[PDB]
RNA sequence: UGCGUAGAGAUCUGGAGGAAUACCGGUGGCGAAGGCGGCCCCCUGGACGAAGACUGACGCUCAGGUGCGAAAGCGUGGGGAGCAAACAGGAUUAGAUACCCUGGUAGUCCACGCCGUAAACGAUGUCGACUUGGAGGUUGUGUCUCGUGGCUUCCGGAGCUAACG
């Protein structure tokens, strides 16, 4: 695809549920989580990222759903 | 005549009519303006034009106070919101920064009849 | 009901060693729970949902005894005499 | 008894009195029969919400081991101090 | 109509009170139904998986009976910010004992007592066996880019239905 979310980023722990700056990158135009094709992560990372995004969303840091342009 | 020189520019934009209230770093409003204050009745006040006149006048009134720079803080959607902004960008003041401080509540307020 | 409090009430009624689920043992545990629950009624008169709980419990015990007395009438009179039901 | 996490937030404007409310804190955790394992002091930080009209608050963390019967009475004495804004005694782990 | 230069509206600060719980919320979740959504503690029900350890079929349904069972309004006491039947006025109209606008009582809120009803609707009760799969999700286990058990959705083989499904 265009650019994998992973490549366009430095080493970061997917466990971090507070670092909204990096988490938002894995967020599409909406609160939906970007697929493996775009995120660039793998099965082991993607699974952790998802949960990380979940908590981050509960913390009110990451939106669950966003409006389309 | 306190020559604030610098302050904040609150922009209460709404579908009813935008209202500007310039203030200092503390928050004490030095002067305000509105479409109604410009002479508009109540239906024409909501127009973006009535927002430009309210923004400029609210500003000019502050020019007297000696303010040169201000920080705009937009609130609530509605016609004349962006109009009031650009209206401020001009005038005799220098818009140093714009921020959308629109509340947009969370969970515990019963919406009005129009919203329900 | 504590662990030992339960394990001990099962041993004292246990027909034989390693007897976990028997007519006399079962009814024994139910009786116990019933007692604590009934005493829970003396207070919290408002707790209606719990009332349904004991209803099922006492109903189960009533059926267990009905089965026992029906088969072995001897084990019945003994069981009741030991517990104190009826 | 078991493990507990006693969070204590207080008026960050406090002066030398800060090292005193903690004195009553220790005097409070004690007597209540609470043994503190470790201790963390985040200090002053930005609150997501005002509370007590003050934007800031003094954070603290004192994981303790005390009877679950006094855990409730442990709270009533802490809230008393007019300086302490809040006190939440959590079970153990926190995601 | 009304309110206004013995000053409200608009604005800042402080206090009081009642009620409801603005994002998350969802197309989601739980409960037998009605219903139920900030957080903490106590008390308590149901339910799922693993180990297969214990009893051992002691079952299924169920006239009558007993119990539960939204809302409404009703009885006594309390409360009453807001809203609002009846109703007080202003408008609209051919007329409006409606819609629109200004007030406003019961009620709406709390405690206790009362009733038994409903598109109480998936308008299709419970249990067991049998009959292609695909995909999303919750939860346990496993040799875990997948297999397996329980639960929650969607699309669908055969088949079923008057058609919808």
Curated annotation (Swiss-Prot), chain A:
One of the protein's GO biological processes: translation
Keyword check for Ubl conjugation: no
Keywords carried by this UniProt record: Acetylation, Ribonucleoprotein, Ribosomal protein, RNA-binding, rRNA-binding
Superkingdom: Bacteria
Pfam families: Ribosomal_S18 (PF01084)
Subunit structure: Part of the 30S ribosomal subunit. Forms a tight heterodimer with protein bS6.
InterPro entries (UniProt xref): Ribosomal_bS18, Ribosomal_bS18_CS, Ribosomal_bS18_sf
GO CC annotation, single: cytosolic small ribosomal subunit
The keyword Magnesium is assigned to this record: no
PROSITE patterns found in the cross-reference section: RIBOSOMAL_S18
Molecular function as annotated in GO: mRNA 5'-UTR binding; small ribosomal subunit rRNA binding; structural constituent of ribosome
PANTHER family listed in its UniProt record: 30S RIBOSOMAL PROTEIN S18 (PTHR13479), SMALL RIBOSOMAL SUBUNIT PROTEIN BS18M (PTHR13479:SF40)
Protein name: Small ribosomal subunit protein bS18
Function: Binds as a heterodimer with protein bS6 to the central domain of the 16S rRNA, where it helps stabilize the platform of the 30S subunit.
Swiss-Prot record, chain B:
InterPro entries with a match to the protein in the record: Ribosomal_uS11, Ribosomal_uS11_bac-type, Ribosomal_uS11_CS, Ribosomal_uS11_sf
Annotated GO biological process: cytoplasmic translation; translation
Gene3D superfamilies linked: Ribosomal protein S11 (3.30.420.80)
A single MF term (Gene Ontology): structural constituent of ribosome
Keywords: Methylation, Ribonucleoprotein, Ribosomal protein, RNA-binding, rRNA-binding
Source species, domain of life: Bacteria
UniProt cross-references to Pfam families, sorted A to Z: Ribosomal_S11 (PF00411)
Leader peptide range in chain numbering: none
Gene Ontology cellular-component annotations: cytoplasm; cytosol; cytosolic small ribosomal subunit
Protein function: Located on the platform of the 30S subunit, it bridges several disparate RNA helices of the 16S rRNA. Forms part of the Shine-Dalgarno cleft in the 70S ribosome.
Subunit structure: Part of the 30S ribosomal subunit. Interacts with proteins uS7 and bS18. Cross-links to IF-3. In stalled ribosomes contacts ribosome rescue factor SmrB.
Note: Has been predicted to contact the N-terminal domain of IF-3 based on footprint studies; exactly how IF-3 interacts with the 30S subunit is controversial.
HAMAP family: Ribosomal_uS11
Similarity comment: family membership: Belongs to the universal ribosomal protein uS11 family.
Annotated protein name in UniProt: Small ribosomal subunit protein uS11
Organism: Escherichia coli (strain K12)
Curated annotation (Swiss-Prot), chain C:
Family: Belongs to the universal ribosomal protein uS15 family.
Name listed for the protein in its UniProt record: Small ribosomal subunit protein uS15
Subunit structure, interactors included: Part of the 30S ribosomal subunit. Forms a bridge to the 50S subunit in the 70S ribosome, contacting the 23S rRNA.
Domain of life, per lineage: Bacteria
Source organism (scientific name): Escherichia coli (strain K12)
Source lineage: Bacteria, Pseudomonadati, Pseudomonadota, Gammaproteobacteria, Enterobacterales
Keywords tagged on the record: Ribonucleoprotein, Ribosomal protein, RNA-binding, rRNA-binding, Translation regulation
Regulation: induction: Part of the metY operon that extends to pnp, also has its own promoter.
Classification via PROSITE patterns: RIBOSOMAL_S15 (PS00362)
Gene Ontology molecular function terms on file: rRNA binding; small ribosomal subunit rRNA binding; structural constituent of ribosome
Gene3D superfamilies: 6.10.250.3130, S15/NS1, RNA-binding
Cited SMART domains: Ribosomal_S15 (SM01387)
HAMAP family the UniProt entry points to: Ribosomal_uS15_B
Known role: One of the primary rRNA binding proteins, it binds directly to 16S rRNA where it helps nucleate assembly of the platform of the 30S subunit by binding and bridging several RNA helices of the 16S rRNA. Binds to its own mRNA, stabilizing it 5-UTR and preventing its translation. In the E.coli 70S ribosome it has been modeled to contact the 23S rRNA of the 50S subunit forming part of bridge B4. In the two 3.5 A resolved ribosome structures there are minor differences between side-chain conformations.
One annotated GO biological process: ribosomal small subunit assembly
UniProt xrefs under NCBIfam families: S15_bact
A Pfam family annotated for this UniProt entry: Ribosomal_S15
GO CC annotation, single: cytosol
Swiss-Prot record, chain D:
Key words, A-Z: Acetylation, Ribonucleoprotein, Ribosomal protein, RNA-binding, rRNA-binding
Modification note: 5 different forms of the protein, varying only in the number of C-terminal glutamate residues, were isolated. The sequence shown is form bS6-6, which is the longest. The first two Glu are encoded by the rpsF gene, the other Glu are added post-translationally by the RimK enzyme.
Function: Binds together with bS18 to 16S ribosomal RNA.
Name of the protein: Small ribosomal subunit protein bS6
Signal peptide: none
Gene Ontology molecular-function annotations: mRNA 5'-UTR binding; small ribosomal subunit rRNA binding; structural constituent of ribosome
Family: Belongs to the bacterial ribosomal protein bS6 family.
Gene Ontology CC terms: cytoplasm; cytosol; cytosolic small ribosomal subunit
Alphabetical GO biological process terms: cytoplasmic translation
Key word rRNA-binding present: yes
N6-acetyllysine modified-residue sites: 93
Full protein: residues contained: 1 to 95 of 135
Quaternary structure (record): Part of the 30S ribosomal subunit. Interacts weakly with uL2 in one of the 3.5 A resolved structures.
């Amino acid at each position: 695809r265009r650019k994998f979310c992973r490549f366009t980023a430095e080493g970061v722990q997917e466990i971090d549920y507070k670092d909204i700056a990096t988490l938002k990158n894995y967020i599409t135009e909406s609160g939906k989580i970007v697929p493996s094709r775009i995120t660039g992560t793998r099965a082991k990372y993607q699974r952790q990222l998802a949960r990380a995004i979940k908590r981050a969303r509960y913390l009110s840091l990451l939106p669950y759903t966003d409006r389309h342009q | 005549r306190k020559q604030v020189s610098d302050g904040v520019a609150h922009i209460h934009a709404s579908f009813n009519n935008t209202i500007v209230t310039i203030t200092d770093r503390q928050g004490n409003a030095l002067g305000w303006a509105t479409a109604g204050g410009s002479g508009f009745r109540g239906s024409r006040k909501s127009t973006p034009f009535a927002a430009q006149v309210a923004a400029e006048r609210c500003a000019d009134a502050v020019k007297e106070y000696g303010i040169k720079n201000l920080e705009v803080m937009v609130k609530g959607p509605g016609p004349g919101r962006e109009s009031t902004i650009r209206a401020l960008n001009a005038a005799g003041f220098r818009i140093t920064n714009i921020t959308d401080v629109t509340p947009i509540p969370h969970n515990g307020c019963r919406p009005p009849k129009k919203r329900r | 009901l504590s662990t030992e409090a339960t394990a001990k009430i099962v041993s004292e009624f246990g027909r034989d060693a390693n007897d976990t689920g028997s007519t006399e043992v079962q009814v024994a545990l139910l009786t116990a729970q019933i007692n604590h629950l009934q005493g829970h009624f003396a207070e919290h008169k408002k707790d209606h949902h719990s009332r349904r709980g004991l209803l099922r419990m006492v109903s189960q015990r009533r059926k267990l005894l009905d089965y026992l007395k029906r088969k072995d009438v001897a084990r019945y009179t003994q069981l009741i005499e030991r517990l104190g039901l009826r | 008894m078991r493990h507990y996490e006693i969070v204590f937030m207080v008026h960050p404007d406090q002066s030398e009195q800060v090292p005193g409310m903690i004195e009553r804190y220790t005097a409070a955790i004690t007597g209540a029969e609470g043994k503190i394992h470790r201790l963390e002091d985040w200090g002053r930080r930005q609150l997501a919400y005002p509370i007590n009209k003050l934007h800031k608050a003094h954070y603290v963390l004192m994981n303790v081991e005390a009877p679950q019967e006094v855990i409730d009475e442990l709270e009533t004495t802490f809230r008393f101090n007019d300086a302490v804004i809040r006190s939440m005694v959590m079970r153990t782990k926190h995601a």
